Amino acid sequence: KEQNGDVKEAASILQELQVETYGSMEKKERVEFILEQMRLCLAVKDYIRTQIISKKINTKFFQEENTEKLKLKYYNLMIQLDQHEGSYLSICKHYRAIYDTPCIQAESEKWQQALKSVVLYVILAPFDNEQSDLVHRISGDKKLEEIPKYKDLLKLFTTMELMRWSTLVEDYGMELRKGSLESPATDVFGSTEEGEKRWKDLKNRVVEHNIRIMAKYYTRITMKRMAQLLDLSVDESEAFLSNLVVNKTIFAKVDRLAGIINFQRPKDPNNLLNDWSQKLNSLMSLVNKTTHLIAKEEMIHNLQ
C-alpha cells in the first residue's frame, strides 16, 4: 500500500506467502492473510495460480460465527474467479452458501439481492439432473414470492408454459430501469460486455429449452415453422440443430431438400410388434379386473 499495489507488489507477496505457514498458521489471521494475495493475482489477471492458493482455504470453515463482515464476503471475489469461463452452476451453489449470513444479519436489501442474484442464472447453467433437482429445492420457498421472478422460475418449469422469446423481452424491460432494488439484474444482464455474452447465452438457454419439448410432442416438424417458433433464421436453426446432434444430446435427423425434419426413434420390426402384444396383454388383463368388479357390484345390490 505504499504505491497501492501493482505487478511488483503481487510478486512481493507471492514470494513471502508460506513463510508464516513456516511459522504457524493462525486459525484466523493466517487465513485472513493467505486469502488476500489472490485478489492481487486477479489484478495481474492470474487465474490458474489463483485457484491453487484458494484451495488451501477450504478446510478452515465455520469461523464465520465470530466473523461479522469478512468471512463469507471475501468469497464474493471467489465468484470473480469462476466468473471467467463458464461455471454457472457452481456459483449458484456458491450463492446458496453465502445465502445464510444476510439472513443471520437480518437485512432486507443485501439479503434480498442475494435472492435476486441466485434466481437469475440457475437458468444459465446447462441442463442436467443437477439443475433439475436444484430448481426443485429452491422452489417452494417462503421467501421467493417477494420478487416477480417467481413467475420466471415457474415459466421455466416444463411443457413450454406457452412461451416466446419476444414475450420474454417484454417481461424484461424492468431489469435495467425499475424494481424494488433492481441491482443484480443490472449487474448480471445490464452490463455492457459481460451482459452481452449473457444476452446471447440467455437466448441460447431458451432455444435449448424449446428443442426438448419439441422432441417430446412432435413426430415431424417443418423447417419454416421451427424457424418462426425459435424467433430466428432457418440457417441459424440449422447450426443449432447441428451442434446438438453431434453433441448426441438430442436425437434428431433432418431432410433438407424438402425441409421436413423428424423426431422419430429409429424403427425396428420386433419392437413395434412387441408393442402390440403389450397393449393386448394389458387389454385382456384389465377386462378381467373389470368383470371381477362388476360381478361384485351386481352381487351387493341384488341382495340390497
Partner: protein, 106 residues
C-alpha cells in the same frame, strides 16, 4: 505445433530458407484443418514439395485422409442432403466430392 518449434531452434536457423517455409504453411493448414488452405499452400510452392523425392506420396496420403476426416463430421445432422450444399460446407468443387463419395460407398 512442434514443427515451428524445431525451425526456430538454433541449429535449424543455420539452414533456413524456402523449403522450411513450405512446411510451415503446410503445418498451419493441417493445424487449422482447412482443406483449400492446404491446396493453396501446395499450389504456391510447386518445385518445393509437389515433386516427390519421397514426400509428395506421403502428402497425398495425408490429404486424402483429410477429406473423409472432414467429410464424416458433416453427415450426422441429416438423413438426406443435396450435394451442392455439402460442397458449400466443405468449400470445394462438387465433381471431386462425387468421385470421393463414390469411393467411400465402394
Amino acid at each position: 505445433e512442434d514443427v515451428q518449434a524445431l525451425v526456430s531452434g538454433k541449429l535449424a536457423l543455420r539452414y533456413a530458407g524456402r523449403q522450411t517455409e513450405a512446411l510451415k504453411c503446410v503445418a498451419q493448414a493441417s493445424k487449422n484443418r482447412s482443406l483449400a488452405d492446404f491446396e493453396k499452400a501446395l499450389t504456391d510452392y510447386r518445385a518445393e514439395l509437389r515433386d516427390d523425392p519421397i514426400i509428395s506420396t506421403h502428402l497425398a496420403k495425408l490429404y486424402d485422409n483429410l477429406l473423409e476426416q472432414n467429410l464424416i463430421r458433416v453427415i450426422e445432422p441429416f438423413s438426406r442432403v443435396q450435394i451442392e450444399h455439402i460442397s458449400s460446407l466443405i468449400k470445394l468443387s462438387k465433381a471431386d466430392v462425387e468421385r470421393k463419395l463414390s469411393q467411400m460407398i465402394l
